[PDB]
Amino acid sequence: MADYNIPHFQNDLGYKIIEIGVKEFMCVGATQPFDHPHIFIDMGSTDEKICPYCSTLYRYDPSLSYNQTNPTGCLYNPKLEHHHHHH
Per-residue mark of binding to Zn ion, 56-85 (x: CB under 5 A): ------------------------------
Quick check: 24 and 43 in contact, CB under 8 A? yes
Which residue in 18, 20, 26, 54 binds Zn ion (CB under 5 A)?
Answer: 54
Q: Does 27 bind Zn ion (CB under 5 A)?
A: yes
Q: Does 51 bind Zn ion (CB under 5 A)?
A: yes
Contacts of 38 (CB under 8 A, 6+ apart): 26, 27, 28, 29, 32, 51, 53, 54
Q: What secondary structure letter does DSSP report for 75?
A: B
For the CB of residue 2, give the shortest distance to Zn ion in the complex, in Å: 24
Residues in contact with Zn ion, counted by CB under 5 A, come to a total of 4
Per CB under 5 A, residues contacting Zn ion are 27, 38, 51, 54
